């Protein structure tokens, strides 16, 4: 389970399309299998 | 055929969604007819 938090304040939040951006894949990113966030669903 | 290249280095790459942005049309853009890139296809 992965959550988004602010840079200057710690508060775990659900991942949404309004706080993440689509980027070109890299080999360093995690390869999630289950419990994908709604941007990834 | 049009390819994308970096600003500080030269490498012809295919045009994807991740290296282009959708903008308001202008008269000084190229009006392509055939062999559209995948963002325009
Ligand atoms: C995810 O998979 C790709 C290709 O299968 C691999 O290159 C990448 O290292 C993987 N990411 C990991 C293991 O975090
Ligand atoms: C592209 O098409 C527009 C019409 O939508 C035109 O105004 C413009 O002059 C054209 N530019 C060219 C031919 O590159």
From TrEMBL, chains A, B:
Protein's organism: Betacoronavirus Erinaceus/VMC/DEU/2012
Residues modified by glycosylation: 31
Source organism, top-level taxon: Viruses
Name used for this protein in its record: Spike protein S2'
